[PDB]
Amino acid sequence: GSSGSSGPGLSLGDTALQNLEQLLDGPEAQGSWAELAERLGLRSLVDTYRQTTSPSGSLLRSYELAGGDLAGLLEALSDMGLEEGVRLLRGPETRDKLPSTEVSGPSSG
């Protein structure tokens, strides 16, 4: 899937969120989620989130509800400095490979 806004759902993966969540939460995190949300415009929700125990996830899944797409988020993360989260959400490239299967031989045995 190469879309996000069009569809009501985010083109992310269970594991993706798990990482993006923790990434934002940490002393090393060049940035943070609290500020990020503000950049997106969900500042009025920053409070309703921090209220829960796992706001990280409840923050992203909600970022789409408003009508945001991966792109928009990538813009905030970058401006904030969070480079990792960005490259992560984007995902690494894909290099073709061989099945390593022993092709059939000649006929008559």
Side-chain angles (χ1 to χ4, degrees):
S2 301
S3 188
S5 176
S6 182
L10 279 176
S11 288
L12 295 170
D14 287 21
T15 308
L17 270 87
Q18 286 287 54
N19 278 286
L20 210 295
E21 295 152 5
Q22 90 178 44
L23 281 161
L24 279 160
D25 270 39
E28 210 281 296
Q30 56 205 312
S32 202
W33 67 260
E35 171 86 299
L36 160 63
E38 297 210 56
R39 293 206 154 289
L40 309 161
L42 320 154
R43 61 201 169 173
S44 201
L45 299 164
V46 165
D47 30 274
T48 312
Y49 295 139
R50 76 159 272 183
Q51 281 293 355
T52 77
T53 172
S54 289
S56 283
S58 283
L59 180 68
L60 294 157
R61 68 154 270 279
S62 294
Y63 164 67
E64 69 164 83
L65 297 182
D69 44 57
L70 204 58
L73 197 64
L74 296 161
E75 151 160 332
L77 295 169
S78 188
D79 209 27
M80 288 189 47
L82 306 153
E83 285 185 27
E84 208 82 331
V86 180
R87 293 170 189 280
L88 200 171
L89 298 164
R90 286 198 88 163
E93 287 293 321
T94 63
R95 188 198 298 291
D96 204 86
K97 45 276 189 286
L98 302 162
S100 281
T101 184
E102 173 202 291
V103 299
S104 208
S107 57
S108 208

